[PDB]
Amino acid sequence: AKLRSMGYALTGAVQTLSQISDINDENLQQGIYLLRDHVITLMEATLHDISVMEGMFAVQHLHTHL
Amino acid sequence: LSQISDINDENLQQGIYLLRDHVITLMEATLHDISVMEGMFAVQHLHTHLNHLKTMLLERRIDWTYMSSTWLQQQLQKSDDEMKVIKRIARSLVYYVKQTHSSPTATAWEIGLYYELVIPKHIYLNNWNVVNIGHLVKSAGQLTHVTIAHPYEIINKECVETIYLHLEDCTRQDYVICDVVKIVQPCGNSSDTSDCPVWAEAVKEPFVQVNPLKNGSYLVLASSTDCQIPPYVPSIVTVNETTSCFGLDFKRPLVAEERLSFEPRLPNLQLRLPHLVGIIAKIKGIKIEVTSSGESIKEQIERAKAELLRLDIHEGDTPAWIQQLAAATKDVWPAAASALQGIGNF
Amino acid sequence: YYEPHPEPIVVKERVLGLSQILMINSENIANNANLTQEVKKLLTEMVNEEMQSLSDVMIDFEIPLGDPRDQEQYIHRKCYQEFANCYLVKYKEPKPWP
Amino acid sequence: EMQSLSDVMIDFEIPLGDPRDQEQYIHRKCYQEFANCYLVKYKEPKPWPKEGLIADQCPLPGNRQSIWDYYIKVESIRPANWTTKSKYGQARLGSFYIPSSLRQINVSHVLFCSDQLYSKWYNIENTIEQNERFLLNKLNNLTSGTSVLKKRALPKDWSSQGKNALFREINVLDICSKPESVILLNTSYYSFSLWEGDCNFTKDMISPYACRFWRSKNEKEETKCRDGETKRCLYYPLWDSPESTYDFGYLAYQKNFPSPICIEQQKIRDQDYEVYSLYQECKIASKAYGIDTVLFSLKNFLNYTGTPVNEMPNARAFVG
């Protein structure tokens, strides 16, 4: 047994955009439009505060965030 | 029960079974991390844990920190993916909170938690909602909306086989949970299909209904033609260039990428209605049952016949009666209709 | 016609009911963390704050099982949490450090 | 925290393409694994020549220093007929002993993973997202289709054509903080001695501490016992003990007082090193064989010795 839902992939078509800005195009309709490329993010880069903290003080600040 | 394992016994029924003996747990023993920490670092780590337990219990959720996963899975005898569904839908109740000792340097508390774990029988992932549209019929002058009463609410399709589900006694704990799920067959006029009732209802002319679909097509049901779309039968409509139909703008849809489909394909079905369905729906002034999917010509007729016969001629509305008889006769005997209509207007 | 239903659907077989009792004791936590009498006061304030807040929004409910006070596992784990490392020594006769 | 989240969420298919095929996924995965990881190749294999190291610039124990791991302590109690020559070969008791594991005859390459040899372009004051872009540009500018750095990138010590575009130059105090780095990468051994005898400097020949040698030489090495020539016997050392002072050479080096410092060069390795970038090899190889393979392949190369270099502490992550 190995579950995996097709609840967001049921219709067998998909309408994709090349930029978030394209969502405001006036001759689009009322539907779901997906941005074509994934957004890749490293937490180390996002959380600046921790970078300058040291020892357990750094560790406890990350715990609160997670 | 004397053991959690006893819940899987095959000759049990659908009810609530309580484990006979309480589970006793010391936090000191559970939280290892703190044991090896020192000073305020230990104190702040416990604060984070106690504040999280409180947040879970306010939402009626279970904090699985204070119960072994291996233990629970071993006892329940379930798969990795069943356990994920079991742990997401379980709910908690706090039935007492008691302070057992209070010094200026020392405290002690006790908490009573009561858990209710739903054990699943079957899980359904690839699901569709039904939307009844129906069909218009123009009968002896009256416009009438006709609908089938389907014996299911959800269509499911995991791989290749389609399945029609009837749900009962359902709630929402993140997912939908139902006590009763019966598997049914779609409607038809045969021994191997469902014999479903058919409803009729009188409506005002002109009738227009246009639903914009999400993929960029339009669903249309209308008593009159426009942009080459036939009347009375519903249809899914798509256009290659923006145009105005039924006094609103039908836009050209954005090109899409093709993926693997899970759309259901229902069986087709011919349906014979009574000749005067429009007069039957009109003199009730409510939505009324007129046939079944799989009914005989004889039973269908002997159903509004006595009712209809007793709409007889009267001294007080002979002209208004004669005009109904014509509209009723027009398709059968057009020569007679034209005569009756004449003697009406005289 | 049809529209997607993205949420899963679970059919119920049965329900299992459990009772868990959670026991907290600051002195056991203060001993392992080598805390001082000043920090013991912080630990005690901190734990009461969180426990009291929970106590203040939850009414009581009767649960139809037997009294924990009658169950072995409740007696054994309560005596341990209070008196695990506590001992009494008796001199042959009273004699003090000279 | 991560496991708890994993334990209540089933999987869902989302109808976009595989991340493994997208550039931004390949570039940020290679960076997060191999940003500061490099491979250095000697012109030919040549190890550090002596087992004893005279390095008075480092303050002795009496902050903690990394070199204290190699520091021979002078003990008052010893067994009967005990000599340094038996244990620590030709090393001077009270200085530093270099193990035979850091002096292998067959070691041809040095593999390291640290951001502590970058020239002035790199600053920890600046932002992570800047310091990423800065490196990512430099590595693109200093390469051409392979993973070999251009000679310009190296310091003047390792190459004739080096201009410190990427790496700084190793200095005198670096031995105290980063021992293995110096012992494995330095081209020549330079001494720093305030020991009476070296370079034929005699106590008369000098033309609170003031003008004085740190450790003066005694008559000979000897022990004496009292009918117990086994466990506990007094030991008389061949030089003095620096326990009392312990800041002499460190304070001398910084020039707070004048003193008869001795420095002698000894050539180990030829100044013709060659340096590969594992971040640039990950990007380039993943375009041909795909990231899943390259990642697994290069992660094993970091565990060539049996301890993975990338999990060592940042200052001590140097392996032959």
Ligand SMILES: *[C@@H]1O[C@H](CO)[C@@H](O[C@@H]2O[C@H](CO)[C@@H](O[C@@H]3O[C@H](CO[C@H]4O[C@H](CO[C@H]5O[C@H](CO)[C@@H](O)[C@H](O)[C@@H]5O)[C@@H](O)[C@H](O[C@H]5O[C@H](CO)[C@@H](O)[C@H](O)[C@@H]5O[C@H]5O[C@H](CO)[C@@H](O)[C@H](O)[C@@H]5O)[C@@H]4O)[C@@H](O)[C@H](O[C@H]4O[C@H](CO)[C@@H](O)[C@H](O)[C@@H]4O)[C@@H]3O)[C@H](O)[C@H]2NC(C)=O)[C@H](O)[C@H]1NC(C)=O
């Ligand atoms: C927005 O979304 C909507 C959906 O909400 C979109 O509308 C949908 O778009 C689909 C296109 O992607 C349409 O599908 C297409 O339907 C065509 C017509 O199908 C019917 O006729 C078929 C042929 O009938 C004649 O010929 C045969 C002999 O070949 C004779 O026997 C007949 O008598 C006829 O003369 C027929 O095969 C079909 O039968 C199937 O469906 C009906 C119910 O509708 C069932 O009763 C049948 O049993 C049968 O279903 C079973 O068997 C078939 C295999 O035979 C299986 O596929 C089923 O799963 C099931 O088991 C219909 O009567 C098709 O011609 C067309 O075929 C194309 O694709 C196939 C591969 O799948 C190719 O092989 C073909 O060559 C061809 O390219 C396709 O299936 C949907 O109908 C439509 N849905 C609705 C509700 O309108 C809309 O486009 C979207 N808009 C936008 C902007 O994106």
Ligand SMILES: *[C@@H]1O[C@H](CO)[C@@H](O[C@@H]2O[C@H](CO)[C@@H](O[C@@H]3O[C@H](CO[C@H]4O[C@H](CO)[C@@H](O)[C@H](O)[C@@H]4O)[C@@H](O)[C@H](O[C@H]4O[C@H](CO)[C@@H](O)[C@H](O)[C@@H]4O[C@@H]4O[C@H](CO)[C@@H](O)[C@H](O)[C@H]4NC(C)=O)[C@@H]3O)[C@H](O)[C@H]2NC(C)=O)[C@H](O)[C@H]1NC(C)=O
């Ligand atoms: C690993 O590798 C690195 C190199 O990347 C190495 O760091 C270098 O270490 C050397 C040796 O300590 C450093 O060079 C010395 O610098 C001294 C200070 O320099 C100032 O003064 C000079 C003028 O005297 C100026 O030109 C300069 O601009 C500075 O202001 C300098 O005093 C040293 O010079 C003496 O020693 C050399 C030895 O070869 C000798 O050739 C010179 O003639 C000079 O005289 C000698 O003096 C000593 C006592 O001081 C005496 O014992 C000896 O008998 C004299 N010899 C003669 C012939 O009279 C020297 O140039 C260099 O700066 C460091 N480089 C960097 C970039 O920091 C590490 O030490 C290596 N580590 C290990 C552990 O191997």
Ligand SMILES: *[C@@H]1O[C@H](CO)[C@@H](O[C@@H]2O[C@H](CO)[C@@H](O[C@@H]3O[C@H](CO[C@H]4O[C@H](CO)[C@@H](O)[C@H](O[C@H]5O[C@H](CO)[C@@H](O)[C@H](O)[C@@H]5O)[C@@H]4O)[C@@H](O)[C@H](O[C@H]4O[C@H](CO)[C@@H](O)[C@H](O)[C@@H]4O)[C@@H]3O)[C@H](O)[C@H]2NC(C)=O)[C@H](O)[C@H]1NC(C)=O
């Ligand atoms: C569900 O499906 C059923 C079955 O198809 C539909 O009911 C049938 O409708 C058709 C079409 O309108 C009818 O066809 C006609 O049949 C007669 C002959 O009927 C006699 O012989 C039959 C032999 O099988 C027999 O079943 C009949 O028995 C019924 O009727 C008697 C008498 O009332 C009753 O006592 C029984 O209990 C049964 O109810 C009967 O003995 C034939 O004369 C017709 O011919 C005309 O049409 C053809 C073709 O166009 C033409 O060539 C001729 O010139 C002539 O114009 C016609 O074929 C059939 O009688 C119906 N059967 C039943 C059982 O009622 C039903 O409509 C569907 N329901 C829904 C809701 O859609």
Ligand SMILES: *[C@@H]1O[C@H](CO)[C@@H](O[C@@H]2O[C@H](CO)[C@@H](O[C@@H]3O[C@H](CO[C@H]4O[C@H](CO)[C@@H](O)[C@H](O)[C@@H]4O)[C@@H](O)[C@H](O)[C@@H]3O)[C@H](O)[C@H]2NC(C)=O)[C@H](O)[C@H]1NC(C)=O
């Ligand atoms: C209404 O229904 C029409 C069917 O009667 C739709 O027409 C079809 O639309 C598709 C869109 O993808 C066309 O595909 C294009 O084909 C051309 C080249 O044509 C040749 O190759 C295709 C297969 O690729 C083949 O079917 C043709 O016979 C030709 O041999 C490509 O250049 C495009 O990139 C694209 O692949 C179909 O060709 C077309 N079929 C027909 C029979 O015309 C029409 O789109 C629908 N209109 C609306 C408003 O929805």
Ligand SMILES: *[C@@H]1O[C@H](CO)[C@@H](O[C@@H]2O[C@H](CO)[C@@H](O[C@@H]3O[C@H](CO)[C@@H](O)[C@H](O)[C@@H]3O)[C@H](O)[C@H]2NC(C)=O)[C@H](O)[C@H]1NC(C)=O
């Ligand atoms: C992790 O440890 C490192 C190593 O000690 C820390 O880096 C050091 O940070 C200090 C304080 O910022 C630096 O000291 C100062 O340097 C500047 C510039 O030379 C000088 O003007 C000041 O007078 C002072 O000396 C120090 O340079 C730097 N390390 C080294 C070896 O030079 C780092 O801050 C620590 N990370 C933390 C706390 O998150």
Ligand SMILES: *[C@@H]1O[C@H](CO)[C@@H](O[C@@H]2O[C@H](CO)[C@@H](O[C@@H]3O[C@H](CO)[C@@H](O)[C@H](O)[C@@H]3O)[C@H](O)[C@H]2NC(C)=O)[C@H](O)[C@H]1NC(C)=O
């Ligand atoms: C709370 O304080 C106690 C008392 O200091 C801590 O126990 C001590 O822990 C240290 C470090 O683990 C032990 O030192 C080491 O002992 C081993 C075994 O003898 C030896 O191989 C090492 O060289 C080192 O000496 C120490 O034995 C132990 N206490 C005593 C009195 O022996 C405890 O760790 C502290 N709790 C915390 C930080 O949570």
Ligand SMILES: *[C@@H]1O[C@H](CO)[C@@H](O[C@@H]2O[C@H](CO)[C@@H](O)[C@H](O)[C@H]2NC(C)=O)[C@H](O)[C@H]1NC(C)=O
């Ligand atoms: C790095 O390499 C070492 C040496 O090959 C690996 O050590 C082995 O680890 C496995 C773990 O299952 C043991 O069964 C072997 O007995 C170990 N061998 C020795 C000689 O210690 C180590 O697993 C590797 N580590 C990584 C992270 O890849």
Ligand SMILES: *[C@@H]1O[C@H](CO)[C@@H](O)[C@H](O)[C@H]1NC(C)=O
């Ligand atoms: C080093 O290489 C030489 C020459 O190939 C070989 O004889 C020797 O076995 C190797 N190992 C050691 C430890 O010397």
Ligand SMILES: *[C@@H]1O[C@H](CO)[C@@H](O)[C@H](O)[C@H]1NC(C)=O
């Ligand atoms: C003096 O120094 C020189 C350096 O070349 C050395 O060869 C010689 O042996 C030394 N002499 C004495 C007596 O230390």
